[PDB]
RNA sequence: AUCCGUAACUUCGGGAUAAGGAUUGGCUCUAAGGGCUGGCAGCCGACUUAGAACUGGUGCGGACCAGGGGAAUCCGACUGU
RNA sequence: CGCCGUUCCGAAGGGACGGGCGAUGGCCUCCGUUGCCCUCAGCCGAUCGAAAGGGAGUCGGGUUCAGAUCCCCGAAUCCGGAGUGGCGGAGAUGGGCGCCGCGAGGCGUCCAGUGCGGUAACGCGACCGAUCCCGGAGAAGCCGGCGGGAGCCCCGGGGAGAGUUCUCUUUUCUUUGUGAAGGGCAGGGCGCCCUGGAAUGGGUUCGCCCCGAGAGAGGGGCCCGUGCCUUGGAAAGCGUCGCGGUUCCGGCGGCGUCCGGUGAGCUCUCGCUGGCCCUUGAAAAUCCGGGGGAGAGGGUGUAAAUCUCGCGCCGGGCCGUA
């Protein structure tokens, strides 16, 4: 059964801290606790160890990532920027 | 019922003061002081989460008085690296060395073709 | 303490230079031959009464023997 | 096609001889009732000959060239096939699967491979087979 | 404690034990909830829940333990010091 | 007077396997010692800092007016030392050829031998090896759930003693052992192995969670076993009845120290799995494994070097303790 209408995972905070802040932290709370698919083994086991550290329980691999998401948009863009600059560097 | 007292002057419940009950031939419960729980070695691969097999799980200074058979395994790296990772290293060593020969011949060939 | 299973190795243990005495204990079900060596108290548990008497008469001479009651 | 054949050099992947080099003496791809899986009888080098240089005498060299061999039956999954093939003729009347009943035959099987390996080693043929794999 | 019931407002999490009622003893039974062995048979069982009759001068959470409640205004968000 | 400073403006090592030289010794055979030279060396910070952190190894019974894990009885263990440090075992007693004998075996040569078993996990009582290098242990938070083992409690019975018995109560109460270390076996755990190839997906927990990067199903290996048995060990202790003595005796005897059940029970502990962190929850001493192969050992033996194996030999000083 659906137990909450909108609070979702930030229902742990009860009435405290304000609706807007609770709404804001909800998006991060979901993401930092999701299990991402591992690129190295494919099993959905990638999980946050600390802030910025993501570990896979299957292949045991650890990856430096975003604070609340496996990879940040800023980093993803830079990887394509560095890939592009590499080619022109050696044509 | 009978209530127990420490047999030593350490009156605190620290990690070096743990005990267990024991009924003696005199028909009374006393405290016996347990030894700390030992740990089997971890693999040198730094990857496999499990501990090694064929090795006594004892405190580090107790390893001095154990024969060698108890502290290792009858295999290369035995007692230091898990079999699973030794398999990977034998292949990895052999397969990378083979790759070197292949590139060496191609590099030599292009030199001849050059 | 060590438990000895065979008579042969009990006799030998009694012949060690560091064996001090042999204690002969009789129970309702067995006769225990205990010899005090330097480190261990070796015991031979005998379930046959007849074998016990044969052993008691063949211990090496000079080993102090004590019967326990 | 099938390549696990006699004379094929393999690396042992498991057991007391993990990482050693052997040569297939007889291959059984289908198996038997005793060993349902596929296996091969191999004769390998427990202890490789030691590096010798021109700065050592004849005696020191002879001492350093002795090989300790072994004979085993292996599940295929514990062997790593290699492109190298080494053709030492190993007497199959002594080196066979039957040596595993009584140790007296195994001593002959191991002694046989010791002599045959040592005679080939000195000739400078199959250098790779007699160098320990550094792993 | 059990059963029922529960408003304004609300940041939809609450408010909430909101508010407001009924019940509660003893005794004698009934029903359901399991394991072991060899849709059945036998042997073992551990406390529960629910219902019914009878019963006492309506007493029964019998001592002990154990929130009064509601409508509002001011200030400070809260927890903390 | 001094302060700052703790690796920072420092020629910060007094050590060593081994090799070469001399000088001395003694179980003068040959091994030791000592002095010099060659060679090799990161640690890089003296020293202090915890009677709750790390830190090998002792338990049971008795005993005092007052001390006992310290005294006594018994049974263990750690560390260090002895090479005149002893014995055993391992290394280690194989093969080919030629005679001799019928053979069982004996001689003569030439070769081998730093152990062995399992497909594997790994196993076996040892099972060479230095500088050097890599790794492990020490060495890791808080909370939740669940499971195993104990101690205690509870329930149904046998005992022994006691209480109530006007009536009732096959009744109520008390009590009903086995240490450390060793061996064996339960039980728990495994992110250990082998066969094999799975969708009509299956397995599975309270929750989860797991699988072609190998699930189910078989068969194995390993870790902890504080649980039970066994040696300890019934000799002891206790319960009880009866006799003794100096009678202030570790006095002596008889019997007993028995069998089951049950639990989200409580306490401790072992383990599996999860959740929280813009919090990630010591270091060092100390001990161990591995990689490497510099060396060493003997020429078939009274075999040698060597051994983390089993026994044996010697010792553990100082301070606190009512
Ligand atoms: Mg301490
Ligand atoms: Mg016990
Ligand atoms: Mg071992
Ligand atoms: Mg209100
Ligand atoms: Mg306030
Ligand atoms: Mg201290
Ligand atoms: Mg399976
Ligand atoms: Mg008695
Ligand atoms: Mg080595
Ligand atoms: Mg005191
Ligand atoms: Zn992965
Ligand atoms: Zn590994």
UniProtKB/Swiss-Prot annotation, chain A:
A zinc finger (C4-type) spans 38-59. InterPro entries: Ribosomal_eL37/eL43 (IPR011331), Ribosomal_eL43 (IPR002674), Ribosomal_zn-bd (IPR011332). One of its GO terms (cellular component) is cytosolic large ribosomal subunit. It is found in: Cytoplasm. Its main location: cytoplasm. The keyword Ribosomal protein applies. Gene3D superfamilies: 2.20.25.30. GO terms for biological process: translation. Zn(2+) binds at residues 38, 41, 56, 59. Keywords: Cytoplasm, Metal-binding, Ribonucleoprotein, Ribosomal protein, Zinc, Zinc-finger. The keyword Nucleotide-binding does not apply. It comes from the Eukaryota. GO terms for molecular function: large ribosomal subunit rRNA binding; structural constituent of ribosome; zinc ion binding. PANTHER family: 60S RIBOSOMAL PROTEIN L37A, 60S RIBOSOMAL PROTEIN L43. Component of the large ribosomal subunit. Belongs to the eukaryotic ribosomal protein eL43 family. Component of the large ribosomal subunit. The ribosome is a large ribonucleoprotein complex responsible for the synthesis of proteins in the cell. This is Large ribosomal subunit protein eL43. The gene is RPL37A.
UniProtKB/Swiss-Prot annotation, chain B:
It holds the Pfam family Ribosomal_L34e. GO terms for biological process: translation. Keywords: Acetylation, Cytoplasm, Endoplasmic reticulum, Isopeptide bond, Phosphoprotein, Ribonucleoprotein, Ribosomal protein, Ubl conjugation. GO terms for cellular component: cytosol; endoplasmic reticulum; ribonucleoprotein complex; ribosome. It is found in: Cytoplasm, Cytosol; Cytoplasm; Endoplasmic reticulum. Component of the large ribosomal subunit. The ribosome is a large ribonucleoprotein complex responsible for the synthesis of proteins in the cell. This is Large ribosomal subunit protein eL34. It comes from Oryctolagus cuniculus. The gene is RPL34.
From Swiss-Prot, chain C:
Its main location: cytoplasm. It comes from the Eukaryota. Keywords: Acetylation, Cytoplasm, Isopeptide bond, Ribonucleoprotein, Ribosomal protein, Ubl conjugation. It is found in: Cytoplasm. There is a cross-link at residues 3, 8 (Glycyl lysine isopeptide (Lys-Gly) (interchain with G-Cter in SUMO2)). InterPro entries: Ribosomal_eL38 (IPR002675), Ribosomal_eL38_sf (IPR038464). GO terms for cellular component: cytosolic large ribosomal subunit. Component of the large ribosomal subunit. The ribosome is a large ribonucleoprotein complex responsible for the synthesis of proteins in the cell. Component of the large ribosomal subunit. Belongs to the eukaryotic ribosomal protein eL38 family. This is Large ribosomal subunit protein eL38. It comes from Oryctolagus cuniculus.
From Swiss-Prot, chain D:
GO terms for molecular function: structural constituent of ribosome. GO terms for cellular component: cytosolic large ribosomal subunit; rough endoplasmic reticulum; synapse. The modification N6-acetyllysine is found at residues 26, 92. InterPro entries: KOW, Ribosomal_eL27, Ribosomal_eL27_CS, Ribosomal_eL27_KOW, Ribosomal_eL27_sf, Translation_prot_SH3-like_sf. SMART domains: KOW. One of its GO terms (biological process) is translation. Residues 6-35 form the KOW domain. Pfam families: KOW, Ribosomal_L27e. Keywords: Acetylation, Cytoplasm, Endoplasmic reticulum, Ribonucleoprotein, Ribosomal protein. It comes from the Eukaryota. It is found in: Cytoplasm, Cytosol; Cytoplasm; Rough endoplasmic reticulum. Component of the large ribosomal subunit. Interacts with RRP1B. Interacts with DHX33. Component of the large ribosomal subunit. Required for proper rRNA processing and maturation of 28S and 5.8S rRNAs. Belongs to the eukaryotic ribosomal protein eL27 family. PANTHER family: 60S RIBOSOMAL PROTEIN L27. This is Large ribosomal subunit protein eL27.
């Amino acid at each position: 059964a659906k137990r909450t209408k909108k609070v979702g995972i930030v229902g742990k905070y009860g009435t405290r801290y304000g609706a807007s802040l609770r709404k804001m932290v909800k998006k991060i709370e979901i993401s930092q606790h999701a299990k991402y698919t591992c690129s190295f083994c494919g099993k959905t086991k990638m999980k946050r160890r600390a802030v910025g550290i993501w570990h896979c329980g299957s292949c045991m691999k650890t990856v430096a990532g975003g604070a609340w998401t496996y990879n940040t948009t800023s980093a993803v863009t830079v990887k394509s920027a560095i890939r592009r600059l590499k080619e022109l560097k050696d044509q | 019922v009978q209530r127990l007292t420490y047999r030593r002057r350490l009156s605190y419940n620290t990690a070096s003061n743990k005990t267990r009950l024991s009924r003696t031939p005199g028909n009374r419960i006393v405290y016996l002081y347990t030894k700390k729980v030992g740990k089997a070695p971890k693999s040198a691969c730094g990857v496999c989460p499990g501990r090694l097999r064929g090795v006594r799980a004892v405190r580090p200074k107790v390893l001095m008085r154990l024969s060698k058979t108890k502290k290792h395994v009858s295999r290369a790296y035995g007692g230091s690296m898990c079999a699973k990772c030794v398999r990977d290293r034998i292949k990895r060593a052999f397969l990378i060395e083979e790759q070197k020969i292949v590139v060496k011949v191609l590099k030599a060939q292009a030199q001849s073709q050059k | 303490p060590r438990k000895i299973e065979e008579i042969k190795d009990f006799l030998l243990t009694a012949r060690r230079k560091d064996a001090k005495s042999v204690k002969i204990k009789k129970n309702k079900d067995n006769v225990k031959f205990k010899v005090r060596c330097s480190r261990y108290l070796y015991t031979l548990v005998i379930t046959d009464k007849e074998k016990a008497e044969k052993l008691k008469q063949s211990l090496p001479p000079g080993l102090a023997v004590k019967e326990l009651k | 096609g099938k390549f696990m054949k006699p004379g094929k050099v393999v690396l042992v992947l498991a057991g007391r001889y993990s990482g050693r080099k052997a040569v297939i003496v007889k291959n059984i791809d289908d198996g038997t009732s005793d060993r349902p899986y596929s296996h091969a009888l191999v004769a390998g080098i427990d202890r490789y000959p030691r590096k010798v240089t021109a700065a050592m005498g004849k005696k020191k060299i002879a001492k350093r060239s002795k090989i300790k061999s072994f004979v085993k039956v292996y599940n295929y999954n514990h062997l790593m096939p290699t492109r190298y093939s080494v053709d030492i003729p190993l007497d199959k009347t002594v080196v066979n699967k039957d040596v595993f009943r009584d140790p007296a035959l195994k001593r002959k099987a191991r002694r046989e491979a010791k002599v045959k390996f040592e005679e080939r080693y000195k000739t400078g043929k199959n250098k790779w087979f007699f160098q320990k794999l550094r792993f």
